[PDB]
């Protein structure tokens, strides 16, 4: 405690009352003339001292601070996700016990926890400065904790996996029975406990309590943002460059989640506060992208998107982010295209894999890279984590910064054709947690091209017969992609005889234009309902207002459904029967069409004004704000 | 009613319950629920009007609604606690004045959309 | 949040804690403890700041309003701020006769502090002794300050600081007091012009009054190569028809927005400007049709991207 060593590298005299050695050392560093006054032994010691301080980013005192450059550089293959390189490093024969320690962290990082536990046990045997011995004891206990946690997780949960043999599980329990990590530091040689007092915190259960409590300042509404960020980088560099397995535990991942989020929200608050007074902050880099990808869950990113506006946050080192994104997408191909899936390495990596591509919306990607991410996401991502419904959203997010070109369109077309290929089986059915299916991908291509025709799908459509019904109705959701010959061939398999077939046709996109026949079919259903008076009725009303129907014989059935007459004739509609709940069910196009009608507008703007004042509903407020309905 | 959550972006209720319903064709379904998907930026056709797309699941499998889906609730069972909750569902069904009042889970596609 | 719509339980316990924090304020600053002070006042400032949402008995309000007005050190709570703390206390409790006497006692002391020509009031928010006097005149209309009128009747020309101080409080003075004060002081300065239009001495700006506004505006113009916002509101409200102030645009953005809305650059528009405006001026802004569409975008942005609910109320009540 003789000095403060600030995160920007400035030393401050704190508590020492003797000679100022740190001030004297920096004077020796700046000018070389006094350096020659030292003895030869002290000259080489100063060079070693000078190397340590420049490598650790401690440059000078506070009062000599000038143009400070605090750029985070983590020299660790594990942090960058260089999965191939660490495999090669593990494969090579290790020269020294320091290389073994790096190997065991890499084995732990690659899901080979049994091998790292054996390696850490080996290092402990051969290492009795004794600093690697202590660090291996910390890491072996940490990996034993990870193995025990993974065994419990796997027993609770898609298929039954047994990554660790029960012989290995029984062995590590007998080696780690009644093992105290708390007594580890105290039982070390007294020379170690003096020289390496700063390593004691690794034996504690929690070591980021100080960093988490200091995060409270980021919520102050009255630099510090640089202090929290540099403190975060300090924790990352120490835990990764020194190869400590605690960097993969829940406490550290949550701490990065808390510190990164609060830094983002604080910068968001500063921007809005600035605009309030100035009337028109956080700049992410490659390391921030990795930190969000590795440590944030998809829900945690979602809490970020709703609270703040990351689209206002500018992303730097996009080629390094792209290299990270092409580098990660390569590993998915290795994990699933081949039989190289490591079930333990699976659990940790897929969460980072999902988060990186979800966060890849905000980064500009080159075409060659974008092909690799898209092809790895579309084809090689297992359906258990990213199903058909969620995968399009990951794919569709990449279009925010990268407007879909031809090459990516081909890949999605490849995906669509492969989706048609799996439909030869009648049992096969797409399972989506988002209510979102293969039709949405084709809509995306038609959105970005408006003229793309799927040749291979046309071949599959033309080959179709009446037998394989699962293929027929699947491609009816892909009608715009088919050619005219394929369109004519497919339409022969369905009929529009009764009203129900019309609704099925309108839902699957079988027909998009109303010939006069369906109007009569539309008309016939309504007279039956009118006769039987003493779901669809509201649906028909919208189509008349949307100019989908020009039969003009719609007013005969005015008086049954309050939504029907509300759409057929807004001028004559009574708005005391109006319910504000409808506007919540209406999409972008319909609400905008109501806004420009010049009828119904002042009534609904009054109902929306009443609702927000009485209830303060954000959906009502945003519906009123965006379209002025 | 302790797991019961009201979403206000769509005036529906989230509840871990199943439904035993009969349509207008006397067909019976047992242990069925619904899921709603708020996707305001969906690439709509010329004839898409509803902001939410709903999938009905029975026996863990989704249904292809080829006919009219007008239906009445005959028995609603809360999954976590087997107490019959049908009276609450019908009471809630009348109030919200919206299609498919009680839904197993709502999926919000707005926050994940690139145009968000 | 709308804290005013949040009910407050255990009100008497809150009041007892509020009067207790008031007694300690008097005791400290009438045997002060400098170490105790630095931690106590932050709680004391916040407790009285939050007391607006608290219904307080007349006896309890008297103790707290006495400590707040008199024994609260000027170092942290300036007279402009101290008014705001006092003003918030009127949200739940309309100013009683016991409380209103305490405020005049403050004004009499403020007049007494103004007998020295060197003394001047310092306010961060721009609120001064004339604004409490408005608060007196707001609740009860026919109030005459007996002690301030006595100092008014004994005024001489030498003690100018009393003359300028008492004129700002002119409503409160009696008929004989104001007549004597009007004999001694006449409205001849740009500061006097605003004070007259505020207290009610002058209703419609005379041609001499515009000449004072023009002469200050040319004085600002030569210095260019905060009363500018007030002048722009006066013109945009049509109370002034001189029509030469179009030659005086460019110094501050608030002025240009009001005088010529069509030619204003609204990228320099400040959303916080809408908050300072009053009901009538806000309605006039919505009715101008020249900036209505522009400020629709500004308000719509603020409700989306800012947490202040005032903008939503401004948008919903007037559709500015």
Swiss-Prot record, chain B:
The organism's taxonomy opens as: Viruses, Duplodnaviria, Heunggongvirae, Uroviricota, Caudoviricetes
Give the UniProt family note: Belongs to the DSR anti-defense 1 family.
Effect the entry attributes to changing residue 7 to E: Complete loss of the ability to inactivate the host DSR2 NADase activity
Which residues are listed as membrane-spanning? none
Give the record's keywords alphabetically: Host-virus interaction, Inhibition of host innate immune response by virus, Viral immunoevasion
**Gene name of this polypeptide:** yotI
Nucleotide-binding as UniProt keyword: no
Result for mutant: residue 9 to E: Complete loss of the ability to inactivate the host DSR2 NADase activity
- Tell me the protein's name: DSR anti-defense 1
Functionally, this protein is described as follows: Counteracts the defense-associated sirtuin 2 (DSR2) defense system of the host. Inhibits the NADase activity of host DSR2 by competing with the tail tube protein that normally activates DSR2.
Annotated site location: Interaction with host DSR2: 49
- Biological processes, Gene Ontology terms: symbiont-mediated suppression of host innate immune response
Q: What is the effect of changing residue 49 to E?
A: Complete loss of the ability to inactivate the host DSR2 NADase activity
Q: How does it assemble?
A: Interacts with Bacillus subtilis DSR2 (via C-terminus) in a 2:4 ratio; this interaction leads to the absence of activation of the NADase defense activity of DSR2.
Source organism of the structure:
Bacillus phage SPbeta
